[PDB]
Structures are given as C-alpha cells and as structure tokens.
C-alpha cells in the first residue's frame, strides 16, 4: 500500500505533530526561562510531581465543568496556534479565515475564567472571575479591530496573503496604533502582568486559580504561556515580517522574532506597575476603541488614495 | 452594666480564670478530643453563626493574623467586632512564674520589631524596685 500521496499526507501529519510538540515545549521551557529572568530538567521534575498528585474534585462542585474550564484554558488558545504559518511549506492550516479563527479562539477564552469562577464554590472567586472576565471582554472587543487594520491593509484574511503583502514594507510602521492596541489586547486577554489579578481592589474577591490542584492547575499554568507564545506568533506574523529575512533560514527568522517579542514581554514583566481596575476599564473603553476605529478609517483613506 | 461582657483572650469554652493565683500555669495533657471539638466549632461557626454572643445585613468572618466578624449592608460595613486572643502567649502569668533575671527573654517576645525597646521598661522598673541608679 506504498503510495507517494500517502507518504506526503503522513509527512504533513508529522509536520502537524512536531509543530504541536514544539509549541508545547516552547511554552514549558520558557516558563522556566521567565522564572530565571525574574536547569531545564526542573520542569520535567515539576511535571513528574504534578502527574503523581491526586486531582481534588470539591464535594460541593460537579465533575464536568470544573475539569472543563482548564480544558478550555489549554486547548482553545492552543488550537489558536494552528493558524500561524512558520514557512511556505511548513504550514498546517491554509484555510481562508486566517484572522477570524483567532477571533473565535479569543472569544472562547473567557469561558475558562467564567467556568472556573462558578466551579470554585466560593463567592470571592466568583467576584474575581467577574472582574477578570469583564476586563478580557473590554479588551477583546477591540482586539478584532486591531487585527482588522492589518486585514484591511492586506485585503484577505489568509495569513499567506498577509506575509506576501509584507514583501515591500512590514505593517508595524504604517500601523503603529494597531500594533499597540493589539499588544494591549493580547496582554489583557491572556492575563499578562499589568492587566492581571483584578482582585487587588477588593478583599471580597479571590482568584479562580484557587481550589485547583495538580493537573487542573498545571493546565492553566501551561495554557497561559502557550497563549502568550501564540499571541507573540500572531503578532509577528501580522505586524512584523513573517518568515522574512535576507540570509538566515525563514524558520530561524520566525523563531528569532518570536523570542525577541517574548523577551520584550519579559521587559513588560520587569518595567511597568499594575494600574487600577477603574483606570484599566476606562483606558480600554475610552482611548483604545476610538483610536483603532480612527486607525481603520485612516488606513481606508490611505489604501483608497494610492490605489492605481 | 458592661455590654458584651465575654471572654476576649481565652476561648469561650474555658473553665477557670488564668491570672488567678490558684490557676496552674502549665499546658495540660493535649487530648485530641478537645482539638477535634474546637475544629468542629470552627466548621459551623460561619453557617450557624449566632449574632447575639458577639454583641452585634450579612455576617462573615474575615481572616499579625486574626479574624474580625464583619456585618455588611451589601458591601458597606455596619458593625465590626474583631476576634483577638489568637496569639496569647501568657506573658504576665509567666511573669508570676519566672524570676527577675529570667523574664528578660519573655520581655523580648512581647513585640518582635521592638526587642531591646521592649526590655527597657521591665529592666528600669526592676531597677526602681531594687533601688539601682545606673551610670
């Protein structure tokens, strides 16, 4: 039954599984990388310890959505990475909706926080989940417009068309407003440090990570970091040059730019303090959304002006 | 005529009075039955709370480390009687038990930030009792 079409199909399956394992181990390894920047076998030891620990189902909870919230937190923003092309011949998804799919995944990302907040039979955890969910909704509302700036510049949703429209000029310099709005929205949705733990203004609010022990907590622990690495991949493939470089191989260039952007995220971890909740919501509603709407109108006028 | 006259430092299920001269100043035999009983009292103190013993809307117990009983009109605090006595080392009763010279570490262990400042008044009062004028 040896046929070359089956060999090519199995090679594509192998490409899918190696990109899945490499993004999983990338998140797992630079978890320790960030902890050092704040011994790679320490994560292996942590995984062994987490595997050899009993998952606690609370007796006041249910055995379905308590375990399904970390399921969402891991797999939704894991399959968000299937969109990203690393090379012309190393892509796993060439479907037409190359931006809307990430919007689906980011929209489903709030389900984990909400379901964890209900699953923890605790009023303070529920209030903290309400605060976090309100924040991530208030930033994922204009996440879409920050992506639509580049989408309107490049025409279609396909990331191949995006990175082929990045041939003459990368989209970071004509659209810096879209870049900063997408960076802010990706920080807030993935719960990165400045837009993180909104329980700081009320002692009647607690985290949704509480009452999660063992594997159900490790799913969040690796899911947020897989989310930030796929958000970095989205960022480079949209605003920077996806696989574009003069001399070094394209996947080396993609890895270098992704590493550069999460060292920039380490710089974000180091530099700015955490703003207050009212300031965060007021910023995300009053400044970001009109600015990205004006950015879309401006890039519309620009792309319709020099259309010859 | 004193409102909410109750035990403040010792738990409410206490038999005698500690600083009275006939009270033995030693730890008794630690029976685990008392520990399990007090754990069971801590189990249903939040759901079966009685707002008449404390001298007190929703009632909760918000967890140095100490707990304070909070009454809330929504999120607004109406009444608050804190629960103290959770760090009662018994400094005075041991002051009746140690000598003048051996109480100095117990004088250190009143507050932890002070230390030497904490042993100043005891030393000066002991010097007053003896009649010592330090150079």
């Amino acid at each position: 039954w040896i046929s070359p079409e089956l060999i090519e199909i199995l090679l594509t399956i192998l490409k899918a599984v190696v990109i899945l394992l490499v993004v999983v181990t990338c998140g797992a390894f630079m978890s320790f990388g960030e902890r050092r920047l704040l011994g790679s076998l320490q994560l292996v030891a942590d995984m062994i310890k987490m595997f050899f620990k009993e998952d606690w189902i609370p007796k006041f909870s249910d055995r379905v959505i308590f375990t399904l919230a970390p399921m969402i937190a891991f797999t939704s923003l894991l399959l968000a990475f299937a969109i990203v092309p690393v090379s012309p011949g190393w892509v796993v998804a060439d479907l037409n909706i190359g931006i809307l799919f990430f919007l689906m995944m980011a929209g489903l990302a709030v389900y984990a926080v909400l379901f964890a907040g209900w699953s923890s039979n605790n009023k303070y955890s529920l209030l903290g989940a309400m605060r976090a969910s309100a924040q991530t909704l208030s930033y994922e509302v204009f996440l879409g417009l920050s992506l639509m700036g580049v989408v309107a510049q490049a025409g279609s949703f396909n990331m191949t068309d995006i990175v082929n429209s990045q041939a003459h000029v990368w989209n970071v310099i004509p659209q810096f407003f879209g870049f900063i709005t997408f960076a802010i929205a990706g920080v807030a949705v993935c719960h990165r440090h400045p837009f993180d733990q909104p329980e700081a203004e009320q002692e009647l609010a607690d985290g949704y990570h509480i009452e999660y022990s063992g594997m159900k907590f490790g799913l969040f622990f690796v899911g947020e970091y897989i989310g930030i690495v796929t958000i970095s991949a989205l960022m480079v493939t949209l605003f920077f040059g996806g696989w574009q470089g003069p001399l070094l191989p394209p996947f080396i260039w993609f890895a270098l730019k992704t590493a550069f952007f999460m060292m920039m995220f380490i710089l974000i971890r180091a530099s700015l303090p955490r703003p207050r909740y009212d300031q965060v919501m007021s910023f995300g509603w009053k400044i970001c959304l009109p600015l990205t709407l004006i950015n879309l109108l401006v890039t519309a006028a620009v792309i319709l002006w020099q259309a010859q | 005529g004193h409102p909410n006259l109750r035990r403040i430092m010792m738990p409410q299920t206490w038999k005698g009075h500690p600083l009275r001269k006939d009270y033995p100043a030693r730890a008794t035999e630690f029976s685990p039955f008392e520990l399990t009983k007090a754990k069971q009292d801590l189990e249903m103190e939040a759901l079966t709370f009685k707002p008449e013993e404390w001298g007190m809307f929703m009632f909760l117990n918000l967890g140095g480390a100490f707990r304070i009983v909070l009454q809330l009109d929504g999120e607004e605090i109406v009444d608050c009687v804190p629960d103290i006595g959770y760090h009662h080392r018994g400094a005075e009763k041991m002051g009746e038990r140690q000598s003048w010279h051996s109480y100095i570490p117990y004088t250190d262990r009143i507050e932890y930030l002070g230390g030497c400042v904490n042993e100043m008044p005891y030393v000066l009062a002991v010097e007053k009792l003896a009649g010592i004028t330090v150079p």
Binding site: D46, I48, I210 | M10, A27, T28, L42, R89
Partner: protein, 192 residues
C-alpha cells in the same frame, strides 16, 4: 538502612526493609519519582506570630504546596486552624517546624500554648532555636530534599503496596559529631 511505614499521632509505625531489596523498571521509576518530588518543592509558609520575618526575608496559594512550614507558636485557639490547613493539603505532604515554638513548647510551657506541632500532626524536619536564620531553613530544605529523595511511596492506587515508606536517616548530630567535637579554639567575644 531501615524503613518505617504508615499503612491504612496515634498511628502505628514499625521497622521494615525496603521492597527494592529483592523489577528493575520499578526501581528506576521510583527513583525518578523521588527525584521529581525532590527538585520541585512548593512551600506553604504559614502565617503566625514572629518567625514570619525570617521566612519573609529568606527570599503561595494553599492546596498546591506539598510542604508546610509551621513557624510560630501553636496556641489552643490556633491549633484547629493548623489541623484544618494540614488536612486541606493533599498527599504527599511534608512538615518543617521552624523555631523552638514548633519543635516543642518553645519557652512557653503555659496553659495557652500547645507543646509543639507533633501533638496533632506529624513533623518531618525540625529546626531548633529562637528565630533561626534563613540559611538554617535552606539547610533544612536540603535535609528534606534528600529525605524525599530516599523514600518508597506507591506510584498508583491500583497495583502496589498502599503504604508510604519513611527512611530512618542517620541523625545530623552523629554525622556532624567529628566536625563539632574537633573544634579547638574560637574567637573571643571582646572583638567583632
């Protein structure tokens, strides 16, 4: 060395020998499990009276930490909180008793002080003395790390012996006896 086991303060423990002295796959797997539990340890620094600043200046949600540091004095009103927080944790669990107040009564032999943490929960590692230095805590972390590195715990609740095995380690005072007795001279206390 000999081993003690607990199988299902009033529990029974008697002396046995490890099952690895007899499956070479299980011996390597148990060693890897002990190594993974060794190098990855999450503490639960319990909030109590005045060994806090020694655990504050040494360098944390509950029920994910497999190690509990009982530091301050154990009172009659705080001991049920200690017991509840101990049963909140999930096995495997280890206890480090910081200071004299947790090893024993700790200068307080009085009515309102429980004479050590051993009266209600077991303690794995003890640190003696009023407030211990954070280096003593870190050395105790080494001690419990090697103690965890030599155990025999069940891998799963389906096949195998359903009893954890503690190691009867050599005490640190006999191991350090030569280095401690063989001290000839010390610095006089009239200088710095």
């Amino acid at each position: 060395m000999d081993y003690t086991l607990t199988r299902i303060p009033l529990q029974k423990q008697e002396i046995v020998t490890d099952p690895l002295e007899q499956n070479v796959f299980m011996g390597k797997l148990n060693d890897m499990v002990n190594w993974g539990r060794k190098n990855s340890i999450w503490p639960y620094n319990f909030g109590l009276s005045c060994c806090y600043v020694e655990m504050v200046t040494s360098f944390a949600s509950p029920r994910q930490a497999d190690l509990m540091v009982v530091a301050g004095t154990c009172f009659t009103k705080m001991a049920p909180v200690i017991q509840r927080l101990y049963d909140q944790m999930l096995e495997p669990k280890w206890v480090i008793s910081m200071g004299a107040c947790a090893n024993s009564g700790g200068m307080y032999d009085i009515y309102s002080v429980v004479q050590g943490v051993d009266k209600f929960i077991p303690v794995d590692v003890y640190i003696p003395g009023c407030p211990p230095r954070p280096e003593a805590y870190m050395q105790a972390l080494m001690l419990l790390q090697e103690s965890i590195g030599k155990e025999r715990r069940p891998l799963s609740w389906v096949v195998g012996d359903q009893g954890v095995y503690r190691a009867n380690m050599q005490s640190e005072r006999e191991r350090k006896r030569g280095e401690r007795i063989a001290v000839t001279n010390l610095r006089t206390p009239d200088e710095i």
